[PDB]
PDB file of N, CA and C in Angstrom:
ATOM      1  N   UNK A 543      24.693 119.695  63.178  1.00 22.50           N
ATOM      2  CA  UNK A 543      25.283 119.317  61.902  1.00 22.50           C
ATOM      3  C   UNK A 543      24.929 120.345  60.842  1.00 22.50           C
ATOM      4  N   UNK A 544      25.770 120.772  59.666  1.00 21.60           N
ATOM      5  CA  UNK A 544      25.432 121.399  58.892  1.00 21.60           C
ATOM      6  C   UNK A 544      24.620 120.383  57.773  1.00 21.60           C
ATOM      7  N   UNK A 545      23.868 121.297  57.046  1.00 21.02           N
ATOM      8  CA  UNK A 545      22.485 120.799  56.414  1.00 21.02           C
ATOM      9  C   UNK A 545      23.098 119.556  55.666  1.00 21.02           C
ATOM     10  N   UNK A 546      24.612 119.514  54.855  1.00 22.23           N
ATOM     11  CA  UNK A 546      24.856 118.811  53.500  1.00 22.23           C
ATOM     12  C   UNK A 546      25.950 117.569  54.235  1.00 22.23           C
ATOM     13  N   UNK A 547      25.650 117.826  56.013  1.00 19.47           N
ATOM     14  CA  UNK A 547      26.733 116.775  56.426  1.00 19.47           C
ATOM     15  C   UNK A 547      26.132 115.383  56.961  1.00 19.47           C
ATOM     16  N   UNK A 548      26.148 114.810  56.812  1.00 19.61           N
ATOM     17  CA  UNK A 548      25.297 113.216  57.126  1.00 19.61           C
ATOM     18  C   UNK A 548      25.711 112.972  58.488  1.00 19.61           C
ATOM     19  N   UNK A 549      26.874 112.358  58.135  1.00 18.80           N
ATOM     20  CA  UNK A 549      27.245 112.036  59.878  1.00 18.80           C
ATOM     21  C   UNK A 549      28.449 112.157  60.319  1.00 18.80           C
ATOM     22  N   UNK A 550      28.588 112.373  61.826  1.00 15.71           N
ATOM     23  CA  UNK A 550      30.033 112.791  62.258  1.00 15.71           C
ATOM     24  C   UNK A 550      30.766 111.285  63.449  1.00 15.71           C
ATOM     25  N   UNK A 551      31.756 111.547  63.269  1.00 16.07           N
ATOM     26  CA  UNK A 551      32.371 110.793  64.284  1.00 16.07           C
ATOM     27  C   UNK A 551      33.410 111.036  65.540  1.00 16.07           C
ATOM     28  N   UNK A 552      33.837 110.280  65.675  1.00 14.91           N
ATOM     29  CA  UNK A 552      34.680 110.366  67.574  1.00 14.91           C
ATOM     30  C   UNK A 552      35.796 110.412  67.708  1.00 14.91           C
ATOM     31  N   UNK A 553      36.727 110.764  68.569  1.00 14.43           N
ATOM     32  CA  UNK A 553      38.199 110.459  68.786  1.00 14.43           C
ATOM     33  C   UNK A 553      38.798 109.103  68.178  1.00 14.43           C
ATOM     34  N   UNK A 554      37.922 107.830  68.483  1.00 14.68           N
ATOM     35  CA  UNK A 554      38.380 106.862  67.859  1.00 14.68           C
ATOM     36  C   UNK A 554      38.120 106.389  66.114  1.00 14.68           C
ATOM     37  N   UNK A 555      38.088 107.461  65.454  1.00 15.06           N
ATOM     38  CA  UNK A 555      37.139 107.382  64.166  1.00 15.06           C
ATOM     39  C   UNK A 555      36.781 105.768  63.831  1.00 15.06           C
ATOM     40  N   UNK A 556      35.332 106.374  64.423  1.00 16.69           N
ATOM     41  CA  UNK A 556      34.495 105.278  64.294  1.00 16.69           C
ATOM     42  C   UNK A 556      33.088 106.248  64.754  1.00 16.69           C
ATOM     43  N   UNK A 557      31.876 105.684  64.230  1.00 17.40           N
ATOM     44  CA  UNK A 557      30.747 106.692  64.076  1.00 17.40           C
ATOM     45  C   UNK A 557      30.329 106.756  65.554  1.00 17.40           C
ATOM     46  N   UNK A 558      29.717 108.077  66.017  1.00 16.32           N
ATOM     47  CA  UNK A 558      29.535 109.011  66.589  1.00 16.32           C
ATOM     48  C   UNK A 558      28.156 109.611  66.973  1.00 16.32           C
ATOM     49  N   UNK A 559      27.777 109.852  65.824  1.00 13.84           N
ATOM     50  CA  UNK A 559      26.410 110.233  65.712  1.00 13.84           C
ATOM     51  C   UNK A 559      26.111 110.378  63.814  1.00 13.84           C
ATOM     52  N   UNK A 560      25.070 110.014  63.543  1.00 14.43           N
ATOM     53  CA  UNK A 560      24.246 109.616  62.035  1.00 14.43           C
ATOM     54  C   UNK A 560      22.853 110.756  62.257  1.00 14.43           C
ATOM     55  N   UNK A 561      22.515 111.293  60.637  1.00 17.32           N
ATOM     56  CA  UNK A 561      21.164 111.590  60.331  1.00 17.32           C
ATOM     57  C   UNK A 561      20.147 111.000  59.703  1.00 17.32           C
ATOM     58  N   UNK A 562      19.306 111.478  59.595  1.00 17.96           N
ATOM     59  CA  UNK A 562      18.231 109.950  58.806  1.00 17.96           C
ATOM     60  C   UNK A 562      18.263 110.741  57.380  1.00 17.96           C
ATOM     61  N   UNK A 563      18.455 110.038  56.280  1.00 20.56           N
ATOM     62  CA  UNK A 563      18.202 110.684  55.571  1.00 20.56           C
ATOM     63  C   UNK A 563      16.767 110.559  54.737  1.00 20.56           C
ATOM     64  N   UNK A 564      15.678 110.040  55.670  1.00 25.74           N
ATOM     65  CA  UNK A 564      14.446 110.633  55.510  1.00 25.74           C
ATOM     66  C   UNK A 564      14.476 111.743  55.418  1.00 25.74           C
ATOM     67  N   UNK A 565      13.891 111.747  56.870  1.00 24.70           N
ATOM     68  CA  UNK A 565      13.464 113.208  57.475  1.00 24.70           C
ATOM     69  C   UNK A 565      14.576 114.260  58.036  1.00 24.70           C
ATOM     70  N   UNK A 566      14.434 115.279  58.373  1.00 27.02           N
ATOM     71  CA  UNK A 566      15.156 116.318  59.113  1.00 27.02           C
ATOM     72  C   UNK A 566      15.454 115.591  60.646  1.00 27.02           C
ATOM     73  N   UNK A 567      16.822 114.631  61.242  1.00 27.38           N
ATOM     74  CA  UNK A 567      16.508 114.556  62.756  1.00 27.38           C
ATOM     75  C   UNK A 567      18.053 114.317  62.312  1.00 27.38           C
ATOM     76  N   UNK A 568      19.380 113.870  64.117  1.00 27.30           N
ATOM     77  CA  UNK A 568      20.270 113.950  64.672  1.00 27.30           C
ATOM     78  C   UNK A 568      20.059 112.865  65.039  1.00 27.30           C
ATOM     79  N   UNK A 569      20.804 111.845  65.243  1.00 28.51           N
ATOM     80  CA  UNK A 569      20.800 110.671  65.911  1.00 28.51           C
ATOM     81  C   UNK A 569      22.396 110.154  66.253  1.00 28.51           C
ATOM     82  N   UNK A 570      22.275 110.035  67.937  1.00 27.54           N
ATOM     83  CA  UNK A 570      23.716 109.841  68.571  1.00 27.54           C
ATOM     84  C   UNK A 570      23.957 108.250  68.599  1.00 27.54           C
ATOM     85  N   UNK A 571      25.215 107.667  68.483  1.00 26.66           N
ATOM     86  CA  UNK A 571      25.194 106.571  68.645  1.00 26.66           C
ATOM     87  C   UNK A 571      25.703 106.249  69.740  1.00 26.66           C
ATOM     88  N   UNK A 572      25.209 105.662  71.128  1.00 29.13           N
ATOM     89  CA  UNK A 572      25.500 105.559  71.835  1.00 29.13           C
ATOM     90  C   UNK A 572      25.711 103.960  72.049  1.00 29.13           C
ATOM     91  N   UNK A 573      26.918 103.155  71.916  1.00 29.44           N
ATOM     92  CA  UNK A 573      26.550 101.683  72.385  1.00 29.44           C
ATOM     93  C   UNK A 573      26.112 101.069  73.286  1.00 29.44           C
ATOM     94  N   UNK A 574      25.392  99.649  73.484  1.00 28.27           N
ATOM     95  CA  UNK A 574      24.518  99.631  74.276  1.00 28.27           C
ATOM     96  C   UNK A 574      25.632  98.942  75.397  1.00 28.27           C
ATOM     97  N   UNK A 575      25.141  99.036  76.627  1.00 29.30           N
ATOM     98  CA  UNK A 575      25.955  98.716  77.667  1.00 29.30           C
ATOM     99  C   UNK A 575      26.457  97.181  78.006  1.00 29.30           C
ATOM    100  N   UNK A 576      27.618  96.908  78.071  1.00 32.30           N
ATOM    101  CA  UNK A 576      28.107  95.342  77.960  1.00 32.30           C
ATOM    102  C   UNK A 576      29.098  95.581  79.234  1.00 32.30           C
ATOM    103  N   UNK A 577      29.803  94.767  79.597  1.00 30.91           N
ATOM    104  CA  UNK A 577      30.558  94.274  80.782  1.00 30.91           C
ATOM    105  C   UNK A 577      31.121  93.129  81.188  1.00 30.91           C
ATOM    106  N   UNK A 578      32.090  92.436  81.519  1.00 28.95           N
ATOM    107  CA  UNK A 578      32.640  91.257  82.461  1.00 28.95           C
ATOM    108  C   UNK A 578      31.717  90.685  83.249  1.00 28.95           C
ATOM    109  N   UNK A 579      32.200  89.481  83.411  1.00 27.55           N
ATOM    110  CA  UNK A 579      31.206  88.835  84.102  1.00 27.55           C
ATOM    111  C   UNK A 579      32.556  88.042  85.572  1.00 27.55           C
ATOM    112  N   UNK A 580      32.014  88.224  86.539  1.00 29.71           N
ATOM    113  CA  UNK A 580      33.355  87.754  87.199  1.00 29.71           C
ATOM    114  C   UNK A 580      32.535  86.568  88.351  1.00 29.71           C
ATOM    115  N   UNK A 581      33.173  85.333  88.485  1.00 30.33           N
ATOM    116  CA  UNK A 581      32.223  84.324  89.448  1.00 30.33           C
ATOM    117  C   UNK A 581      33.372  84.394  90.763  1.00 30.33           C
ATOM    118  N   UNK A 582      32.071  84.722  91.838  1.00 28.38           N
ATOM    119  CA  UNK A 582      33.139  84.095  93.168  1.00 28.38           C
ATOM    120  C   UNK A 582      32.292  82.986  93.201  1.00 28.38           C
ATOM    121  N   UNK A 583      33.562  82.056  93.619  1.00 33.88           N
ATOM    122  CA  UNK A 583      33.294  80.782  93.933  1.00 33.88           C
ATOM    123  C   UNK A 583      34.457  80.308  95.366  1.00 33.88           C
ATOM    124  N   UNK A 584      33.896  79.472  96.175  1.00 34.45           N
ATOM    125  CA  UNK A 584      34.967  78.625  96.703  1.00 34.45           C
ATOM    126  C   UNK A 584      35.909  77.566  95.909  1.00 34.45           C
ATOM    127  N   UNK A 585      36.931  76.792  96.730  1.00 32.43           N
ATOM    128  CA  UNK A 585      37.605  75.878  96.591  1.00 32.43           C
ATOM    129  C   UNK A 585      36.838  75.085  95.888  1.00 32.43           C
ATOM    130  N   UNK A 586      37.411  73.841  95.238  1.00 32.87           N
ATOM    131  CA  UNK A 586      36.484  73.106  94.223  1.00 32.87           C
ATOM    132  C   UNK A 586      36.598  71.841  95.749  1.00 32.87           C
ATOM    133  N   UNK A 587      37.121  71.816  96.554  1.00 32.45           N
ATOM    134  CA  UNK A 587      37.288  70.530  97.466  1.00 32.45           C
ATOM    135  C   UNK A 587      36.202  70.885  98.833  1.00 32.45           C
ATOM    136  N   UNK A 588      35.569  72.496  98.340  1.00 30.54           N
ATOM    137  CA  UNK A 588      34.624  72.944  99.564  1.00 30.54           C
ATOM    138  C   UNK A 588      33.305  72.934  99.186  1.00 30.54           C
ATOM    139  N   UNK A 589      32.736  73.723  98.486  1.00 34.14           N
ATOM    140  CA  UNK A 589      31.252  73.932  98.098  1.00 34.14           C
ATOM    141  C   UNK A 589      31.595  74.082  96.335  1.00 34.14           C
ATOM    142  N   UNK A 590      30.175  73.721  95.356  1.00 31.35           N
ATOM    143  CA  UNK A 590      30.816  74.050  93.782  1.00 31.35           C
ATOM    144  C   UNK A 590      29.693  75.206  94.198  1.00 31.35           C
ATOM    145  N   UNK A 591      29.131  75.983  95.080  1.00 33.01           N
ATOM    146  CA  UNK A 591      28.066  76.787  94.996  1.00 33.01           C
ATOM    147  C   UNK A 591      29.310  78.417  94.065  1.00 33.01           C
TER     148      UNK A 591
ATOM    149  N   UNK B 838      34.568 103.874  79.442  1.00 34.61           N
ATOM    150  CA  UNK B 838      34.122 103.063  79.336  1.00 34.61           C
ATOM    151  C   UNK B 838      33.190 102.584  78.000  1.00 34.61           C
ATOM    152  N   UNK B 839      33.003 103.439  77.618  1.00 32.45           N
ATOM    153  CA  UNK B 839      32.051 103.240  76.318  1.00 32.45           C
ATOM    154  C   UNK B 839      32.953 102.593  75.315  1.00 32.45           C
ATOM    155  N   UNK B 840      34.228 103.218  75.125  1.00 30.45           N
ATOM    156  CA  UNK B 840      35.392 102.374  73.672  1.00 30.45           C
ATOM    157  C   UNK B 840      35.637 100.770  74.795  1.00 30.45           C
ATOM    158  N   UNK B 841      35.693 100.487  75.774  1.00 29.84           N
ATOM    159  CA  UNK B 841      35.995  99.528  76.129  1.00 29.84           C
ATOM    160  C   UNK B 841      37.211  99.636  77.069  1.00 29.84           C
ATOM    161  N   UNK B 842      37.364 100.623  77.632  1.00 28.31           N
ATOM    162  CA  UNK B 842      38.358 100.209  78.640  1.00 28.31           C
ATOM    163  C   UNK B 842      37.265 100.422  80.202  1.00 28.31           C
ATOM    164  N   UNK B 843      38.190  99.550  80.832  1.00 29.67           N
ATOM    165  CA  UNK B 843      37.089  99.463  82.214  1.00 29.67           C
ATOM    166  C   UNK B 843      38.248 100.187  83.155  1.00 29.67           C
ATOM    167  N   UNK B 844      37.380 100.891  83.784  1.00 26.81           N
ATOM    168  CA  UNK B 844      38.571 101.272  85.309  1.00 26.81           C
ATOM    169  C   UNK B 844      37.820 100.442  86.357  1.00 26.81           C
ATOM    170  N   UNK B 845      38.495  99.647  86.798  1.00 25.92           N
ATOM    171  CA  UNK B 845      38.537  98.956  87.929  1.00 25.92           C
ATOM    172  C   UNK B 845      38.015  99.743  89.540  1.00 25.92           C
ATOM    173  N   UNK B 846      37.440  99.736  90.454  1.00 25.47           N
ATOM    174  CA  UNK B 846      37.599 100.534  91.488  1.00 25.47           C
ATOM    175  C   UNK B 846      38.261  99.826  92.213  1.00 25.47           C
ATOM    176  N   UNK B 847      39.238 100.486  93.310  1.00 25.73           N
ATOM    177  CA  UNK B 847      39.842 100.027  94.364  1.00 25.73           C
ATOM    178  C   UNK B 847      39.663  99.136  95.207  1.00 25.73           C
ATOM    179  N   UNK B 848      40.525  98.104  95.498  1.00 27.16           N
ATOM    180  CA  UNK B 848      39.716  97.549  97.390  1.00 27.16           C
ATOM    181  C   UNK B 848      39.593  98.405  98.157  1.00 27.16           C
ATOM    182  N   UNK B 849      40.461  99.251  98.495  1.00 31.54           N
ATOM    183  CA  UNK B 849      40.256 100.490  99.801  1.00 31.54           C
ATOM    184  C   UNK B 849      39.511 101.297  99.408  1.00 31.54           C
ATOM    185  N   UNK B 850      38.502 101.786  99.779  1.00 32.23           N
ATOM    186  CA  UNK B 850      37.695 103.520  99.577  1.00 32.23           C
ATOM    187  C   UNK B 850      38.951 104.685 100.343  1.00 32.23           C
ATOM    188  N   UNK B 851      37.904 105.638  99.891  1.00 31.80           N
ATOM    189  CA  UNK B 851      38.309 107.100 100.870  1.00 31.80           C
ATOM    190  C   UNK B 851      38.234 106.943 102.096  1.00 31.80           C
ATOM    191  N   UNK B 852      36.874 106.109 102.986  1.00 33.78           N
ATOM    192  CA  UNK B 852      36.602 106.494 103.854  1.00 33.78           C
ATOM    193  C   UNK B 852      37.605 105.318 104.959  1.00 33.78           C
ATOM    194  N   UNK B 853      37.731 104.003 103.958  1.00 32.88           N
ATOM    195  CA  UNK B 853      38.141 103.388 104.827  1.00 32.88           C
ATOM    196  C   UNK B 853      39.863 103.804 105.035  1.00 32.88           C
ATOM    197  N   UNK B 854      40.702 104.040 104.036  1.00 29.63           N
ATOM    198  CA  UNK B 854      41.965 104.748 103.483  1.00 29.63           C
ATOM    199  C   UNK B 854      42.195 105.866 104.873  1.00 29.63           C
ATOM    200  N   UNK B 855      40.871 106.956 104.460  1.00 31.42           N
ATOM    201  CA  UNK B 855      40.871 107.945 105.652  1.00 31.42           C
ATOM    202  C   UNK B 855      40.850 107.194 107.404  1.00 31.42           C
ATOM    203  N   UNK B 856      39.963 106.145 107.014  1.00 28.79           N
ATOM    204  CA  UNK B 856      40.204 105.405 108.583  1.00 28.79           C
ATOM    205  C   UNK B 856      41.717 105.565 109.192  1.00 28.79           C
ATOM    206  N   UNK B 857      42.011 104.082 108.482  1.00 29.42           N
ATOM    207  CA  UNK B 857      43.471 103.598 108.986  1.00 29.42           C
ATOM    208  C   UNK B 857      44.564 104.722 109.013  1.00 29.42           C
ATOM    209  N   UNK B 858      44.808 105.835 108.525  1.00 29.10           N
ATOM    210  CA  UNK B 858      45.296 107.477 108.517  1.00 29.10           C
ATOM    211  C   UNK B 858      45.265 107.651 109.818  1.00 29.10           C
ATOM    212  N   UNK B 859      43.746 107.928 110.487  1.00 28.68           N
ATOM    213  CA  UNK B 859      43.227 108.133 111.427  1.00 28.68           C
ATOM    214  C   UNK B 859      43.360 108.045 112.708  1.00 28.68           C
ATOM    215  N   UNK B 860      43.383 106.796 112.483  1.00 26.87           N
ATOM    216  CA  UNK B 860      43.981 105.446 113.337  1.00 26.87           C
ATOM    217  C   UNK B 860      45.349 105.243 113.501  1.00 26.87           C
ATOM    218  N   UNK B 861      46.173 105.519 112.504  1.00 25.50           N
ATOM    219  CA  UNK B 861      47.297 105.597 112.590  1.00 25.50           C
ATOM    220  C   UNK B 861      48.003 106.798 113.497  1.00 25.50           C
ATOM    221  N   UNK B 862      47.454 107.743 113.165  1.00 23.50           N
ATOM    222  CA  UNK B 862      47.971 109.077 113.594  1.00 23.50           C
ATOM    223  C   UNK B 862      47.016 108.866 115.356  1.00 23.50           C
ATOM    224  N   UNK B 863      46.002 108.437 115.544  1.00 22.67           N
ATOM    225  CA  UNK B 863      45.978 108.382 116.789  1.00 22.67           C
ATOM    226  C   UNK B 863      46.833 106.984 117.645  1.00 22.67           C
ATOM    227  N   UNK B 864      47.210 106.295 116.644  1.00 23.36           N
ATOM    228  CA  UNK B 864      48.118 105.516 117.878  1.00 23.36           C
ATOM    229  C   UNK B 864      49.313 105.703 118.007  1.00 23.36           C
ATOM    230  N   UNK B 865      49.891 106.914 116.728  1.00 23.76           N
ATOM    231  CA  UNK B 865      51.321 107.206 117.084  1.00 23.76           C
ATOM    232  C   UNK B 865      51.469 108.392 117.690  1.00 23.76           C
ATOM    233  N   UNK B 866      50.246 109.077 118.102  1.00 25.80           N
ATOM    234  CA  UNK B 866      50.352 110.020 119.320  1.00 25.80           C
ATOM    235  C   UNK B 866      50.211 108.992 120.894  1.00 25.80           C
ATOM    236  N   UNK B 867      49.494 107.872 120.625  1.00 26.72           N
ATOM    237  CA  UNK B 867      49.313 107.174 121.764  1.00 26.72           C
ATOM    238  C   UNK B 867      50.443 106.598 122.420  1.00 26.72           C
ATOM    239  N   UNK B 868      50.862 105.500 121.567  1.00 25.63           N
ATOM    240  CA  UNK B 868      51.993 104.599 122.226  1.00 25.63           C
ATOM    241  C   UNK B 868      53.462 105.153 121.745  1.00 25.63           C
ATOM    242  N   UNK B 869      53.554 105.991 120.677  1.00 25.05           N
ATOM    243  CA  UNK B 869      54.359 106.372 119.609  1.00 25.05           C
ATOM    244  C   UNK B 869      54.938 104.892 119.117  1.00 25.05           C
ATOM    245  N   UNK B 870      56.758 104.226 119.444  1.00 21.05           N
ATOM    246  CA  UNK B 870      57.592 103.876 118.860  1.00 21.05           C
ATOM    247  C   UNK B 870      56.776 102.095 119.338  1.00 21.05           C
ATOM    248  N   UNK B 871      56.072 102.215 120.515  1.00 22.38           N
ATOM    249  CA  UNK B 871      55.740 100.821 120.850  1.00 22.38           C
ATOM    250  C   UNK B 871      54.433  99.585 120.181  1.00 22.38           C
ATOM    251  N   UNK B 872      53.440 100.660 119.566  1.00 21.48           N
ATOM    252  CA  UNK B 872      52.300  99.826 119.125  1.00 21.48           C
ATOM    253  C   UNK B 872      53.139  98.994 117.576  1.00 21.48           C
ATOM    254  N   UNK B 873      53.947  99.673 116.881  1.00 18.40           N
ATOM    255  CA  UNK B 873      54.729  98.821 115.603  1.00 18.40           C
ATOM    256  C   UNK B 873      55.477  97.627 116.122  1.00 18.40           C
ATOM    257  N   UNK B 874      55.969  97.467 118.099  1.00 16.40           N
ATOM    258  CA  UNK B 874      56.739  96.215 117.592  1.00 16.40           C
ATOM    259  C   UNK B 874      55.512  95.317 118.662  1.00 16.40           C
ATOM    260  N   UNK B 875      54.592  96.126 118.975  1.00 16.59           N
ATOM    261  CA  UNK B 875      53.813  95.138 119.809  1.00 16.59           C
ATOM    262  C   UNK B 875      52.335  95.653 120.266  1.00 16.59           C
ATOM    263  N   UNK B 876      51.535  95.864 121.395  1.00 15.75           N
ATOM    264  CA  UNK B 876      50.525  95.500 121.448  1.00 15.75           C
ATOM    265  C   UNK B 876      50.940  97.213 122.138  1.00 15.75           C
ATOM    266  N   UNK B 877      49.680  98.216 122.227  1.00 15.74           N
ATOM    267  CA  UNK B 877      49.993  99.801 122.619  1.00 15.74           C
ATOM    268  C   UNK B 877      49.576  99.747 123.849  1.00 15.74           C
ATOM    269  N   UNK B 878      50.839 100.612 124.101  1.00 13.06           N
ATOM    270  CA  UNK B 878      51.141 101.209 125.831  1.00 13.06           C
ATOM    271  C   UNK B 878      50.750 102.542 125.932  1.00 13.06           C
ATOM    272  N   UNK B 879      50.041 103.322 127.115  1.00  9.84           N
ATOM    273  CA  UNK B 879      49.804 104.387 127.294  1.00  9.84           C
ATOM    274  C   UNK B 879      51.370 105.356 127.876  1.00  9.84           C
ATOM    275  N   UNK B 880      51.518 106.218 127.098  1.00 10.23           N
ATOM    276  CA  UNK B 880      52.298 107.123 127.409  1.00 10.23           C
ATOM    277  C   UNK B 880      51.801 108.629 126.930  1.00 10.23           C
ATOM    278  N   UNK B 881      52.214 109.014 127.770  1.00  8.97           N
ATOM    279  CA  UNK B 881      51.754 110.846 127.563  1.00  8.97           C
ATOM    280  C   UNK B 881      52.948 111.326 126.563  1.00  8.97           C
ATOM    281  N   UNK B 882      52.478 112.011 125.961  1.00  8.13           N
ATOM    282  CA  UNK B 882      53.457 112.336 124.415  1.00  8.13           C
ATOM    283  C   UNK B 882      54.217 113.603 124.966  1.00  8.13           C
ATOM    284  N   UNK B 883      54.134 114.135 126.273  1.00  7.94           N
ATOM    285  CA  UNK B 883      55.072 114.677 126.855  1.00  7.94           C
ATOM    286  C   UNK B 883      56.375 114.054 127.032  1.00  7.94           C
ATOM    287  N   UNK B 884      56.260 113.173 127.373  1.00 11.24           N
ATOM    288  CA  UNK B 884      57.459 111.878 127.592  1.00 11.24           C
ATOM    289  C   UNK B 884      57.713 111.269 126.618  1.00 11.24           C
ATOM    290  N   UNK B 885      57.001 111.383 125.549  1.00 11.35           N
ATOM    291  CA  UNK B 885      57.376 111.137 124.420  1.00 11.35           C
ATOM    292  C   UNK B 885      58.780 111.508 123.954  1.00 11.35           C
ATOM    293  N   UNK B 886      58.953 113.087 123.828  1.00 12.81           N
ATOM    294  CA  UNK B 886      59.525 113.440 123.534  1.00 12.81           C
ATOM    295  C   UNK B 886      61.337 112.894 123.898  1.00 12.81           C
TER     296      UNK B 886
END
């Protein structure tokens, strides 16, 4: 990043990566990992396992 | 995957995909025209022809 730029963003403009504006650092935003949830199950007339 | 789209993986793999290929191409050197309407016959692919 250049010194006077705070933070940049992504193809989907939406943030990307942020600086602290403490100190001198880079910080990526990476979201944290989420997913589907999918149940096998049998027939409801066989097992409810 | 990170914006939220999921790619799904296949039911078939490579290896199993590459199977049935495999398999295929060795039973239509085997029986040729006969294992599709029924159960495979040995014929020499000389006589095939």
């Amino acid at each position: 990043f250049l010194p006077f730029q705070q933070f940049g963003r992504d193809i989907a403009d939406t943030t990307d990566a942020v600086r602290d504006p403490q100190t001198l650092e880079i910080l990526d935003i990476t979201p944290c990992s989420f997913g589907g949830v999918s149940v096998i199950t049998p027939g409801t007339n066989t097992s409810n396992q | 995957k990170f914006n939220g789209l999921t790619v799904l993986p296949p039911l078939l793999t490579d290896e199993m995909i590459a199977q049935y290929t495999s398999a295929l191409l060795a039973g239509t050197i085997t029986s040729g025209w006969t294992f599709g309407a029924g159960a495979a016959l040995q014929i020499p692919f000389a006589m095939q022809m």
